[PDB]
Amino acid sequence: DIQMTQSPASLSASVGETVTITCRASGNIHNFLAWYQQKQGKSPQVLVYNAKTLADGVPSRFSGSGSGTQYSLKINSLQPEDFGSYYCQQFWSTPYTFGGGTKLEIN
Amino acid sequence: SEGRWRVIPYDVLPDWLKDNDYLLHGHRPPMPSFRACFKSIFRIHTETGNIWTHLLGFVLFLFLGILTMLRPNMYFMAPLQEKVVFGMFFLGAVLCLSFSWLFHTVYCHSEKVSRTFSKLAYSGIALLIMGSFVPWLYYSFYCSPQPRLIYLSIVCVLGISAIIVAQWDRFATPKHRQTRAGVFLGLGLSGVVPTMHFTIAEGFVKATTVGQMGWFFLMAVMYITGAGLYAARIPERFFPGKFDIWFQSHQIFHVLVVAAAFVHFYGVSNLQEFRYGLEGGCTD
Amino acid sequence: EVLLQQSGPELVKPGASVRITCKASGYTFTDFNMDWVKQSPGKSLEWIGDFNPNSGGSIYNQKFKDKATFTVDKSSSTAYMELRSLTFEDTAVYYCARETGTAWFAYWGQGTLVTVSAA
Ligand SMILES: CCCCCCCC/C=C\CCCCCCCC(=O)O
Ligand SMILES: [Zn+2]
């Protein structure tokens, strides 16, 4: 079971600043990583799949990077509507696993 | 167990994987993993036929290559010359077929990977056509060094020009499918001039009984048929969705390349026996 | 457009079973796989399994092997998940997500809240 580990856990920043969420995998997942944004009480929406491919309709500020076991999700200019919960998942190992999550606050 | 995937329809493909709108189903999804791309060789998809045609063909000319290269030197008039000149043919053949089946495997990796192997597969075609003239021009003008070097200069500047154009991103776009056909077809059209030269320089009867006059016909037909099927997508255009996996236009073009290079080798071989045979020696 | 409509909220006593619906529309239902995700309140997402409606196969998470059971109705483009022997640890929101070749989810259902209480 490939277990993911999100570093920020609880992220706080202001409007316009650059933030980054990392996601370290226990084993190699070969860029089979997806990022999701979930709002309170609603379903998650994919932001970046296949490590770096930006999903359709996602603003350009969301960027995906990394390779092998370490990956990242960067936000260029943080926006007041970017608050919520962010998750990383891997779809390489036989039992798919999500990260711990990262709550994002905007001051 | 790990790295699982399923084929997707055409509509849910990214823009860099939509090269043929007549192939409706059976496409590999974008998988940025070389391990998954090479394992897909043993799975059914739109690229399975394209891969195995030039994967097997690369072995055919790897066998034909090192068999001719390891022929005992006591059988050649000029072992160093005839082998280096023959080597350019099998070198362009091994490069062309390797750059092709590699391209059709990592085609679904990413945009950067597909863009890179696309230029290699395009340049490999020119390397094959350039390398095909090296043994043919050597024995055709075995006694005339002036046109032998002039035609080599023309084929070089025409093939390098084709490779230069092959490095352009808009060259590989679907709107220029007829353009990519005309480029490498015009590259083979250059060989018409030395073919007529050899016919009038030697006897018109010798151009038929000696060597093969049907060599030009077999080659020109496979050049025309290969370019036509490629630029028009003939099998799938009539019935889209009926040729997603097998007998598509790209597959028949892949086989025609291996068949045409096979005929050219068999043609240059009998073209070689005439040069160091009597009545085939140098004359004024 | 592609839409995944799930059943309404469930309120059952412990020890009972339940069946969650995932009505698919806007695409060929047999062309893609459908997954099931569990999200406990205040916790992260848990992958329950996937389902291949074209071949009928299903791969479960060993955490839920004796918990969930996947069913299909190709004639209505609908998927089902069946949770048995419900306890308090099963009170969560259960999603159905669709793949696109590989298991990255571009389409999600609105979610089905199954609450287990004895009040
Ligand atoms: C001995 C020469 C061997 C190579 C030439 C024979 C095969 C030629 C194939 C096609 C000729 C016209 C080219 C049009 C299709 C090429 C498209 C492509 O670049 O893949
Ligand atoms: Zn090809």
Residue numbers in the entry:
A (entry chain E): 1 to 107
B (entry chain A): 0, 89 to 371
C (entry chain D): 1 to 119
From the paper:
The D208A mutant of AdipoR1 [residues 89–375, designated hereafter as AdipoR1(A208)] retained the full ability to activate AMPK, whereas the corresponding D219A mutant of AdipoR2 [residues 100–386, designated as AdipoR2(A219)] lacked the ability to increase the expression of UCP212. The asymmetric unit contains three molecules: two assume the closed form, and the other assumes the open form. Molecules A and B assume the closed form and molecule C assumes the open form. In the closed-form structures of molecules A and B, the major cavity is mostly closed, with only two small openings, one to the outer leaflet of the lipid bilayer [lipid-bilayer (LB) opening] and the other to the cytoplasm [cytoplasmic (CP) opening]. The closed cavity of molecule A contains two oleic acid molecules. In contrast, in the open-form structure of molecule C, both the LB and CP openings of the major cavity are much larger than those in the closed-form structures of molecules A and B. Two monoolein molecules, the host lipid of the mesophase crystallization, are bound in the major cavity of molecule C. Helix V and intracellular loop 2 (ICL2), which connects helices IV and V, adopt different structures between the closed and open forms. Typically, helix V is differentially bent, and its N-terminal end (Arg264) is shifted outward by about 11 Å between molecules A and C.
